[PDB]
Amino acid sequence: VESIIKTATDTVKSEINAELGVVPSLNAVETGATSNTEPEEAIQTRTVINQHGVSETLVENFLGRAALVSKKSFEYKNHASSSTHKNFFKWTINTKSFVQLRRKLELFTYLRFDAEITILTTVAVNYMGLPDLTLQAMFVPTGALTPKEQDSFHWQSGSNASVFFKISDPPARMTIPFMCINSAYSVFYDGFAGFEKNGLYGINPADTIGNLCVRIVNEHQPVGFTVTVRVYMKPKHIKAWAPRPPRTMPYMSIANANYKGRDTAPNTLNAIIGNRASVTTMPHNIV
Amino acid sequence: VESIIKTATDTVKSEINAELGVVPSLNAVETGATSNTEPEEAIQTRTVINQHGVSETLVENFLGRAALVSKKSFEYKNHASSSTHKNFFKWTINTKSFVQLRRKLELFTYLRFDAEITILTTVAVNYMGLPDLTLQAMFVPTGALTPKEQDSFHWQSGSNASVFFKISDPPARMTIPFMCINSAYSVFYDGFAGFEKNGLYGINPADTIGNLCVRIVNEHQPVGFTVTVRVYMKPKHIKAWAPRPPRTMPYMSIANANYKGRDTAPNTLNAIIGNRASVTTMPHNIV
Amino acid sequence: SDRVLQLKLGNSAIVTQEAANYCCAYGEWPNYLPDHEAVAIDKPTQPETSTDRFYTLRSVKWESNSTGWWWKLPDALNNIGMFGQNVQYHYLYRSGFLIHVQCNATKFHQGALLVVAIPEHQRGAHDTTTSPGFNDIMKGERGGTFNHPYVLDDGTSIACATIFPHQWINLRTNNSATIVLPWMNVAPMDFPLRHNQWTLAVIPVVPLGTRTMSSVVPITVSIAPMCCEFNGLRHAI
Amino acid sequence: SDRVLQLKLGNSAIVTQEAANYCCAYGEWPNYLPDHEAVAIDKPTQPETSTDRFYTLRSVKWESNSTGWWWKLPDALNNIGMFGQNVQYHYLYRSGFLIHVQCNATKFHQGALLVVAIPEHQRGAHDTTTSPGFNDIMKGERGGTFNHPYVLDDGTSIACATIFPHQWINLRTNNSATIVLPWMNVAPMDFPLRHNQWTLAVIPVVPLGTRTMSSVVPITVSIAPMCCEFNGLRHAI
Amino acid sequence: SDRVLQLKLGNSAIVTQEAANYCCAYGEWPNYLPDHEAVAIDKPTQPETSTDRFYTLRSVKWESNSTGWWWKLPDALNNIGMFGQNVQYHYLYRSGFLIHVQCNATKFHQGALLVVAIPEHQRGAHDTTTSPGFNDIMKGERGGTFNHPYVLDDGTSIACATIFPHQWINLRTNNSATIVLPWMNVAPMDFPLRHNQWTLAVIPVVPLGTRTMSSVVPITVSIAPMCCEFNGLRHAI
Amino acid sequence: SMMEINNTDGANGMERLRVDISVQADLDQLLFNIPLDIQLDGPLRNTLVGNISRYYTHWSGSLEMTFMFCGSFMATGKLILCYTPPGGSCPTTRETAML
Amino acid sequence: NFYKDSYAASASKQDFSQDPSKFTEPVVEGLKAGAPVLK
Amino acid sequence: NFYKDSYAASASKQDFSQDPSKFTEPVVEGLKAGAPVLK
Amino acid sequence: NLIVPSESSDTCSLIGFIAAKDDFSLRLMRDSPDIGQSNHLHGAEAAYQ
């Protein structure tokens, strides 16, 4: 059943059919199998040597795109009287915050991939020039010890991987390997990640890549700036299993699949598709 | 009839001719064929080994140049009270806005090529320095969903291709493949792209590469700047078919071949070539 | 020929005279854990017939306004027979499942049930940001009910649920659905009390209807674990 | 020898005793769509003789002040004979064309007509930014007239129109022009009612003139589709 | 096995799950006109798929007091689709026909229809010496009705009509009848507008009856010309 | 996957996923039609082919529509399903659709 | 790939293997073309 | 070309094939040199 | 016509399905119009706390 497919299948010419006991257009949906009726059996076809390629739909390409997974802006200044991200922040990595990437990953049940991480930094004066700051992004394992201050000694990063980059350089980039304790990440998890009953549902910690701690290395300047850090993730060397029904209702939370639907169709809880006047009303009918 | 030509053809010496029934200088334009009279048959020639190359006129080179196809300047600032491109713009790609490139492409009926796109950015203060801004150019398919704000979540670009670049870097560059749904682009289209009768004439949507959405990623600065984005296109891996009469009348619109002509010759509707006193008046006659 | 079928495992057997072939999830078949995929090093127990047999759960009634039913595995069987005992005494378990859903009526009745096995069916809650609680998920042998079958109670859709292993019970055609499920997980074994590999969903896409004598029309589910293996023996939880 | 010619297709034939050889557009000849270039998978209908034959359109009068005439293909024939019927009943069509333009006069008459087949002749409108409308383009069998033949009604020029397949009818030399057109498009087939592959243009570059008895001098166009194929059968539009 | 059948011609297909084998008139099968039997010397057009496909006519209602229906060929199709266009544009035509009559009911309904293809069914008028008129014979797509089915409206008898190619639709047994008709004439081709080779007759020998819910029971006719050929091209009549 | 053919006001949830047909009093009755752009909103949008195709801009290939009758065993009937290539207005009579 | 860890390599877009039947026809007994599916 | 997609490659300026006759002499019967074109 | 006996429902349902055949091809990837967001999802900002 398995084979190598590089182009769409060709069509063979077909003749008139009038055979007793042969009914290719009839099927039985109850079996769970999709109709196997071929065009050649439904109508008279001609021969067509189809050269249309199928590579753009390869899973590697479908998911192989650097998508925004994190966007964080904070104030870079003297935080003497701040209540607030004081020249640094910590982000628990997750791929559930931005909907375009989330919906695509959720088209699958399990996924195994390495993750190329790209970090883009932008600055704005709160005018007399934009400073070329040096930033440090330290990878701190899930639930591990994160820094509490811009100048914490935790940033010495003796074992944690840290990347130092300048705003004037191209975006920083590095690859995090497929690091799950299992053979694949669980895009969905129908269970509780704890031995007691009060744990969180649908959250398998084994699927959390980890914490990303980012700080501005430079001491504060006499004036304040707004610094925004954007993180992009591109999966590669991908293996995917068990495709799933696409998300239709708007997402509500990054922690679950809770739904509500839009106020009015399309994509409302009682009507996914927009309405038409009746089942015999042809929208966009050619007049 | 087809052959490999790398240099202009040589000339062979010729002798005196006085043969009955042989009249190489006479032709019949009515047949539609161009005169086949050779220099050797019209006059007495010497032998000439011609080494003049013909590569600069290869179609690949003739059209192989990065030409300006889009120039857009907008204000980068706090657009709180703006009616206006608010730190971003959308451009429906087309090769009909700048006349030098347009006229050359229109020397052909059909064209198949990949397009190298180069994006050049320039800035001016509306003095205390020029900021090294980061821009994002997102390719959004023809008629597809474009962002409505500088900070729209649409910019997360989960599947659309986006290129992030700095004003301090060399111009951004990437190649858009020959993406037409047909085997070649239609430089001219004698038809209507819709099943009804009110559609636009001469516009085959299949020939619109798509939308280019460009924004400044940085939040606005305390002062305003004028940012200009220039897009250049260079076709390559070119195949061309059916050459055409060159455009003579000034272009009037990017949506059609409408014409009016200049107010006075040259290139006026009733006179393409400038006038001379009479058909026996030699302009620039050597005195 | 492909309408009659007999399933026999252990001391249990089931026959149907109105089947519609049968489904092998993703074209696979259950099997024991091979040495080259094993992780837990203690010698496993493979009880065979005491656990690999059909367990019939309590029936449910198909009503004109029913929204659908679901049963999570292994939860639905974690307290039934010797399968339940092994599950309670062992930290780790592994198995496939042979599912047989039953529903007969009359030549005058109409209705269509989608019978689908959903891997990792993580439920969502409706109109709230609070995640579903333990009791909303672990229903055991009784199973649960769909609140919004139209979106599979997870914000997606039943329309595309056919992407999962399934069959249908269309009353004018058949009276049973059969699906064979292999071990489905990212790990070779798992803790049975906190994670459900599969969710059996039975949803009436076409409501039950007739103009003949009204009778209670039940839907019954029989499930047989296959190639059961247990590791990490201790006391019962 | 190259001045006399007989064209025969289907139940139609045409002869001329004053031809000037004949033109094969771009040195090609019409042919049926090969399997390695096909897209539409339904078996096409190839009516042959019922469609591949000469259709003679209404004549036009060559006057001393005429600017020229044009006919777009397949539009000019979309409502004529069986070619027209196949076009109306099918979403897709494909064909080449054999064009024969006729115009005879007297040994005392003078005049020269450029007979050119223009691929994708997208018309432009004069002195306005508004694009030409449907009725400015689709004239059918009657064809249209040139407003500014000097620029081919598209802002270019008739002077360079010889770059397109053509012949001339110079009264002292010949009385007919013949051009064979192959399928010309970027797609293997097309919807005949909204796109015209070719435009036949007949323009008097040298006006009709004489000092002998004045007579009505007509110009007649006969066109024969070649290797017609139709796909996407349905009801007539 | 001989109760299910799929017929496919051109872009059309039909299936039945309650057939009764199918009839090939006189054991023959349609074919194109061979050179050794040809008369008209012009090259014929063989449109194939545009004409050799199923055309479904308007249905009729089977009532308790119905006398029967008839449709003459090619008259019934002379104004339908591309078959109709070719017929109107050509003096001569030739073809076979694949006939499929449809009528389903309930396991509680009874009735029997004789479905017979009569060659040269020359009608007679009742109680008068005046021959039937043009409008009594040419009904087109609507077909006609039997006045005295007992004598086949021609003074003979329906009792012996079984001598002609036929099948029956006996409600308790089948819901469709299929008859393949070859070209039937004394000439290789004919003028389609003045002569009908075959007449399809559907007559209820056993009236429709039941004691269950009364419903409109239609009878539908689908006809596919086969191996169509046309000669003598001209303008449309 | 299931087409949402009954995408009409008044049809809620799963009612939108099935098309009800009744015993007719008249002949050759039109039962329903389906717009075919798998790239626009309509009965075909929320299907496996529709959802995935909408992550792309160009498409080519044959589609297949399968209908399962879910009436009772004692119910009988014959329907005609027609695909009309583009060019005109949607057919409203069987005599036209049948072509 | 000049890096020492293979997971650092560029994408692998060469796996053209397919087996749609695991999703389209997961029935134990293969369905023959033309033959009635239910017998 | 170090990119994986061939369309990304640099220009192809090596096609020296030509056939002017498709534009200069598209007549069905070739015209012989010196011979009267119309005969 | 749909024909049924007295005790069968006289209104029946059809379920329509659609799928692509293996001669299908898709090109030019783009963001899907079927999903979008105008605000941060609940809990997104908490990932920073």
Ligand SMILES: CC(=O)N[C@@H]1[C@@H](O)[C@H](O[C@@H]2O[C@H](CO)[C@H](O)[C@H](O[C@]3(C(=O)O)C[C@H](O)[C@@H](NC(C)=O)[C@H]([C@H](O)[C@H](O)CO)O3)[C@H]2O)[C@@H](CO)O[C@H]1O
């Ligand atoms: C006015 C009328 O005749 N009929 C309307 C009908 O047009 C309307 O349908 C909606 O119409 C819009 C066009 O205005 C879109 O086509 C809607 O579709 C989609 C889209 O394709 O863009 C589907 C998509 O899934 C939706 N996305 C999300 C993330 O929710 C988008 C989205 O809502 C829009 O883009 C909004 O910006 O819409 C289509 O449903 C129906 C509604 O019942 O009502 C008729 O009366």
Ligand SMILES: CC(=O)N[C@@H]1[C@@H](O)[C@H](O[C@@H]2O[C@H](CO)[C@H](O)[C@H](O[C@]3(C(=O)O)C[C@H](O)[C@@H](NC(C)=O)[C@H]([C@H](O)[C@H](O)CO)O3)[C@H]2O)[C@@H](CO)O[C@H]1O
């Ligand atoms: C004064 C006299 O004796 N005779 C003029 C004669 O010179 C004039 O001809 C025009 O003269 C100019 C030089 O002044 C150019 O040579 C004009 O030619 C072109 C050019 O080659 O540059 C042709 C070209 O196509 C034109 N381009 C466009 C885009 O329109 C340009 C263009 O107009 C100029 O460059 C303007 O800047 O001109 C040539 O015609 C004729 C006019 O009738 O009149 C004589 O009296």
